[model samples]
Target: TAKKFKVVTTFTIIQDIAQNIAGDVAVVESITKPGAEIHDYQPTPRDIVKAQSADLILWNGMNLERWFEKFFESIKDVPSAVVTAGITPLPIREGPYSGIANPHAWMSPSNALIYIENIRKALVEHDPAHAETYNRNAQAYAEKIKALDAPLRERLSRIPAEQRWLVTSEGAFSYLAKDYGFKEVYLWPINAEQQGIPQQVRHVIDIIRENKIPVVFSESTISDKPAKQVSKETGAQYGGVLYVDSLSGEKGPVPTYISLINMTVDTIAKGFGQ
Candidate 1:
């Protein structure tokens, strides 16, 4: 019997995407569990062992995995691929980490296409014997992802330009905002910093009040208290959680990559009174 190629991903969202492209030809697993915060995630000894035995590792590059350097150092022989290889990253415009590339590229459907292509290429390179299967699966998945662009744009377009503001707990929607033309606001630039600090909360409150934005959201990986507090103070509605670094579990709202984006857009549309 042929052995399945073991592929480890830094987080669940990428794990789901890799599995979608690899099909049954490879075994894909995420080092971080579902709903785990990728930023500031600490890998355990068991995780190191998993990577040590993996044929390939896939990660969403652009500094999303804070502990990746030490993790990679422990498994020097394993080949790893950056799924965001070809996409230009949006920089963190304002924060302690200003000028750093925003690591949430997968939040945008268009950027997701690039990630799918990179996954396909990496899988093919690692398992040439199953290249055909990987290619076919990737093509089908890419079409499904591309199909989302038009409808998501249409759904989001229902909101007037001035009202198209997306405020969240973390600045994870930079790519999504760029793709859909929404002005992005968040309580903090990245999850690694102290979240919901006085100045941070106050800053977002000012934005919400000045713009009269109707709704705010938080990522599934973090607490919504900050967003809810902003809502309380500024009178903006607190929209539900948005899946960014990880997908929800099987029984949850966003079990796959497609559903994550679809749910996010739908939630935003409904929250903004569309």
Candidate 2:
């Protein structure tokens, strides 16, 4: 077989998505390893070399990877695609980055389809020799994501009306909340600025106490301590970790994009079961 087209993505979640679309016709690798935080990832020397060597590159845009720009600058010639291009971004509702796009568009399966399509087009454009494979894989993968909608809605609906809040350390789930109809709450809007501060955590605590939100969760990339603190102080359960920007390693729970989404749905549903 001809050498597989080389496709490198910004992070593991995108890497998994790209692999889904590329199928066996392309070799997909992520610049940031599984479980690495993407929001502020510092690409290393090896990451630069791998990106330069790839035939095509993929990234989640809408400001998710500000760290990626300088890294991508070194490999400009490689064909690249902003997989989140066509999805309408939801704004960071509050905090330092308020009004900016949340940058986690792939959290929503609805938006994930657009990412799949963009990846398919990028693949076909650069490797038309396997456009057939990319096209078929994209469609099939999209269907698999689509299948999650009904069950997701049903599962999420299992949460009681008052406990339907998705409280996390960062406001990373705006897209998923927008799709799944969860009332989103967070300590910080976009991750960095003044995270878990007295003021930020105070606001979250007050909200949780007032609404009596049953559980609070945190992302895998950042500290779950703030979330656990909230759960402790507010008499709420420490729900669980929510996998956002990155997936887990091969032996971990969320190794694939589908597993990431499914596991998230299950976690939230179980968390809200209280």
Candidate 3:
């Protein structure tokens, strides 16, 4: 067996990226699991211990992980990389809150190419012997990402621009909305911030009423109740759950990042079809 480097990531999406590039050369452990909300997650002692001992740690940055800076401060000496550095992040479309950038660039396949490049660079820096392999794997994976972009765009474009309003529980879909020309709405600036606030509910209801959009969505990792309530209040159709905070469990529809994006686009498009 090849020697494995201890690679730790803040969450499952980054873990998936690491696995694709590092292959069997590294042991990747994601601190955030499937169906876990990264925004509100409090790291366990085990997570700290793992980060302290890891050869490399990766995070999406851009305030996606509210505790990320504190977590790194706890292990400041450890080698860590921010994967969003090279990716072109989309500006946050204002929700009830003002001036917050959306940190979920991975939802946009075109933007994810930057993640692959950033991960490849990190792997080469850490394991020079496998540099060629890392580059090769990054290239292959990026092509797969490129393949997803067109179909996703086509699906998103089919929904008329007026009806392309996307209301979700979190502001995570900003980049996807920006790239594909949909108007994005969220219950709160951060999922943990106004989850239970009546103001959020009222605000979303107003948007739904104003736009006359018939559907709103819930995410896999966050409570659907908020979106559900918004739909109920406005009499809009409650669109099905989306895969955002994390990928689904093995048996669920979106088991991988690629499938997650594809399924999410399809689901959203179908919802607008009504």
Candidate 4:
């Protein structure tokens, strides 16, 4: 039997994109499990081992994995690809943390198209034997993304323009906001700035009240205490969880990147009466 190229990704989002390009020609491994936040994630010994043994490592690389230095050190010899490098990341304007580029590029389907291009190039370079499969899969997936874009745009447009605001713990939805023309507010620039402080909780609550937003959301990977508190204080409806930063566990609402975006947009559309 021919050997399959061993490809490993830093997290599930990248894994989903890479798998789309690699198809079944590469064996994919995700270091962070579903529901695991990757911003401050520390790789385990097993994760290091997987990187060391893999043929290529795919990472988002806009300061997404703050603890990636150690993993990169371990996998120094492995060919690596950064899905976010060539894409123009959205600038961080305001939050608990600032001056850093937002790392959640996959939230924008357009940026995701660029990611697929990068992944396809890497796959063709490292596993030329499977180049045909990689190209074919990428083209097919690109078409699917094209189909997803229009409906998502229409769904977001359905939200009353003034009422469309995205508030979350991390500023992970900035690109999504950009794509859908929604205003965004966040408690912290990064999830590492935990949403437990009085100021943080109050800040978001004020935004909710001022915007007259009916629903606020919690994410799958983080505690909902702050969002719940904001909802109680502002009399806004507490919407379902939004899958960002990380994916869900196999049994959860969004187990993959593709599904996560779909789930988030659908939930938001429903909450806003779209």
Off by over 4 Å in 3: 95-97, 250-252
Would you give me the overall lDDT of model 2? 0.85
TM-score of 3: 0.92
Order of quality (TM-score): 1, 2, 4, 3
Could you tell me the TM-score of candidate 2?
A: 0.96
Query: Candidate 4, residues 16-55: lDDT per residue as tens digits?
Result: 7787787777878788887787888978888888888899
Q: Write the per-residue lDDT of candidate 3 for residues 57-141, one digit (tens) a residue.
A: 9998876899988888888577888888766656665644456666888888888888888888988898788787788888888
Better of 1 and 3 by lDDT: 1
In the range 1-274, model 1's lDDT, one tens digit per residue, is 4789899999988988999998988889999889888899988999999899999998887988889988999996899998898899899998778998999998889888999999999999889999999999999999999898999998888888877888888888988898888998888888885644777899889988988888999888898888889999988888888878788887877889899889888888889887
Q: Is candidate 1 or candidate 4 better by TM-score?
A: 1
How well does candidate 1 match the true structure in TM-score terms? 0.96
Instruction: State the local distance difference test value for candidate 4.
Output: 0.81
lDDT of each: 0.88, 0.85, 0.81, 0.81
lDDT of 2 by residue, 44-74 (tens): 8999999999998888889888887788788
